[PDB]
């Protein structure tokens, strides 16, 4: 018994793929069934989906509406149609063989599997944010700092997200104070890093700040800086 | 008037499921083609994540995560804007907020008026009724001669319906014994399995050199087929 997975490859996210399992030594007429299962890089092992000779089939809740068992038995092939992939399907797929014995249903003769690479991207421009959170006191002034991977300009903007609240615009274009901002708060930048001064802290400043480019699509935001106020 | 956004649509949806966001504007009515208007969303304890904005001369922008599978469409006569969603996921489960960025300049395109949000929750609630398989431990170290015990607990009975695979780095998984204690053909003798309670146990009487590896159980009680996470065996 032999099983030959065919089909991998880069495949954009929101993309369509279909993978081949080709089977040899048996019929998948005949207890017969094939089972396809991925690994993700450096993970474990999820179970897909399974079709059996009956055409009975069964899917996983994380792939069912968008993948697509089936086989052509006239080529002792099954497939699994991937549609609207996203970065969690990059995995290696293998097939297998799942033949009843009721007590004996095992999967085997796994295939050497097929890689899936789910990607467009290393031009996306990266924000990091530090500290990631702080505690101060009443009075104080804080800085936060936030720094892009390239040159973005001057199109910075910074967010201040209360708990349980949207975001509210704080500061735009690096040092421009929206509306109702008052002026105990400031940005600034220095080539690709942009600080936010909080002065005078206030209890209402408990929050989290979020930085965001939009010189290039994607906007990209920093992974945000709570705020504690003790 | 307030100036607002006001978000509605979501709620609880199986993955493969499909949705659609509303953002309706108060107290300012969308430019032309709903420009401006952006999608965010921030899944539950994380970030901000951008997802997609109706940007000038017909150019839908959209992240790389949702492209294919989101659509944003306004329509201005009812001054609202939509976010339609397929092919969900898991991962998509976020609250999802709309925005109005500012349009007059490049030197200005900042989101204002975010709406309050609107919880989208991507699962099929079935986490409770698929079968949980658990190892202990996820991983060890042993000498060669060293008898190695690997155990997996099943959440829920699943009679003796239980296989142990074996992989390889860089290889295909190998099925080592099926119904507990079942040894496939060509597998050596000092592999073998049992089971106590709901405990299954996979014993390597005495580790060789090629046994180094990671083994996985898989019960078949139930569709959905499920496996441990793994136990791997170093030198």
């Known amino acids: 018994?032999?099983?030959?997975?065919?089909?991998?490859?880069?495949?954009?996210?929101?993309?369509?793929?279909?993978?081949?399992?080709?089977?040899?030594?048996?019929?998948?007429?005949?207890?017969?069934?094939?089972?396809?299962?991925?690994?993700?890089?450096?993970?474990?092992?999820?179970?897909?989906?399974?079709?059996?000779?009956?055409?009975?089939?069964?899917?996983?809740?994380?792939?069912?509406?968008?993948?697509?068992?089936?086989?052509?038995?006239?080529?002792?092939?099954?497939?699994?149609?991937?549609?609207?992939?996203?970065?969690?399907?990059?995995?290696?797929?293998?097939?297998?063989?799942?033949?009843?014995?009721?007590?004996?249903?095992?999967?085997?003769?796994?295939?050497?599997?097929?890689?899936?690479?789910?990607?467009?991207?290393?031009?996306?421009?990266?924000?990091?944010?530090?500290?990631?959170?702080?505690?101060?006191?009443?009075?104080?002034?804080?800085?936060?700092?936030?720094?892009?991977?390239?040159?973005?300009?001057?199109?910075?903007?910074?967010?201040?997200?209360?708990?349980?609240?949207?975001?509210?615009?704080?500061?735009?274009?690096?040092?421009?104070?929206?509306?109702?901002?008052?002026?105990?708060?400031?940005?600034?930048?220095?080539?690709?890093?942009?600080?936010?001064?909080?002065?005078?802290?206030?209890?209402?400043?408990?929050?989290?700040?979020?930085?965001?480019?939009?010189?290039?699509?994607?906007?990209?935001?920093?992974?945000?800086?709570?705020?504690?106020?003790? | 008037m307030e100036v607002q956004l006001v978000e509605s649509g979501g709620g609880l949806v199986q993955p493969g499921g499909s949705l659609r966001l509303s953002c309706a504007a108060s107290?300012?009515?969308?430019?032309?083609?709903?420009?401006?208007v952006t999608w965010v969303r921030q899944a539950p304890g994380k970030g901000l994540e951008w997802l997609a904005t109706?940007?000038?001369?017909?150019?839908?922008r959209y992240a790389d995560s949702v492209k294919g599978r989101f659509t944003i469409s306004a329509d201005t006569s009812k001054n609202t804007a939509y976010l339609q969603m397929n092919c969900l996921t898991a991962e998509d489960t976020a609250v999802y907020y709309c925005?109005?960025?500012?349009?007059?300049?490049?030197?200005?395109?900042?989101?204002?008026?975010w709406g309050q949000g609107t919880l989208v929750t991507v699962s099929s609630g079935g986490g409770g009724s698929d079968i949980q398989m658990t190892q202990s431990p996820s991983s060890l170290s042993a000498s060669v001669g060293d008898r190695v015990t690997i155990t997996c607990?099943?959440?829920?009975?699943?009679?003796?319906?239980?296989?142990?695979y074996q992989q390889k780095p860089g290889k295909a998984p190998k099925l080592l014994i099926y119904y507990t204690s079942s040894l496939h053909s060509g597998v050596p003798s000092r592999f073998s399995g049992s089971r106590s309670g709901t405990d299954f146990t996979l014993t390597i009487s005495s580790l060789q050199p090629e046994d180094f590896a990671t083994?996985?159980?898989?019960?078949?009680?139930?569709?959905?087929?499920?496996?441990?996470?793994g136990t791997k065996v170093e030198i």
């Open positions: 925005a109005q960025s500012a349009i007059t300049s490049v030197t200005d395109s900042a989101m204002d008026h």
């Open positions: 107290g300012f009515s969308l430019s032309t083609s709903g420009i401006g």
């Open positions: 109706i940007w000038w001369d017909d150019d839908n």
């Open positions: 965001q480019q939009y010189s290039k699509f994607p906007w990209t």
């Open positions: 390239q040159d973005i300009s001057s199109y």
